[PDB]
Amino acid sequence: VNSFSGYLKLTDNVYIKNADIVEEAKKVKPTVVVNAANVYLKHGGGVAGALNKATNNAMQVESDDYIATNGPLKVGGSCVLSGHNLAKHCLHVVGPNVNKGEDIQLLKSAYENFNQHEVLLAPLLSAGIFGADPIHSLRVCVDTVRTNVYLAVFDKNLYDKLVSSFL
Numbered sequence: 102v103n104s105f106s107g108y109l110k111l112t113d114n115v116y117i118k119n120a121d122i123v124e125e126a127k128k129v130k131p132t133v134v135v136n137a138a139n140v141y142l143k144h145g146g147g148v149a150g151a152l153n154k155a156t157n158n159a160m161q162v163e164s165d166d167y168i169a170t171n172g173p174l175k176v177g178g179s180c181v182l183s184g185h186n187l188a189k190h191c192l193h194v195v196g197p198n199v200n201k202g203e204d205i206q207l208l209k210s211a212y213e214n215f216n217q218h219e220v221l222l223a224p225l226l227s228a229g230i231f232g233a234d235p236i237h238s239l240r241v242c243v244d245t246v247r248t249n250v251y252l253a254v255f256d257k258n259l260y261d262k263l264v265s266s267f268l
């Protein structure tokens with residue numbers, strides 16, 4: 102039993118809800134919230150901008166120190182940093198960016214990072230400003246993640262298309 106409330110169950114391990122991921126995190130304080138990061142951990146917009154703004158820029162300050170020490174992430178890669186006021190940990194995961202020209206096959210590699218955590222709150226990787234089709238992202242998630250993932254989708258209308266088209 103966990104405190105995630107009101108999610109539709111898609112499979113044995115994948116759940117989905119129309120919700121603000123920042124509000125879900127603020128409400129649930131999960132062990133792990135996933136950020137839709139880029140390789141430079143520059144949290145400008147989308148999920149990343151919203152998460153970082155909710156931490157009062159502390160996520161960005163921590164991230165800049167991480168990059169100064171370690172250099173950029175790989176597309177498809179991840180790092181674990183603090184969850185600040187939102188979660189115990191934030192798993193920063195880099196899905197491929199279609200608006201940058203990155204190969205969508207790396208989306209599976211990106212989702213594999215979730216398997217290192219038993220339970221996660223997460224957005225749909227590579228969707229939104231990263232350019233990929235959210236329906237495809239959901240399919241890759243279901244076919245790749247084996248741990249318990251709670252997907253928060255902010256837009257009610259997008260949330261409806263994903264449910265109604267789910268195989």
Ligand SMILES: Cc1sc2ncnc(Sc3ccccc3C(=O)O)c2c1C
Binds near residue numbers: 122148230254256
């Ligand atoms: C202020 C908040 S909370 C939040 N929680 C989740 N996703 C997004 S944006 C997003 C990212 C990837 C796939 C779909 C969407 C979507 O349109 O729902 C957001 C935004 C902008």
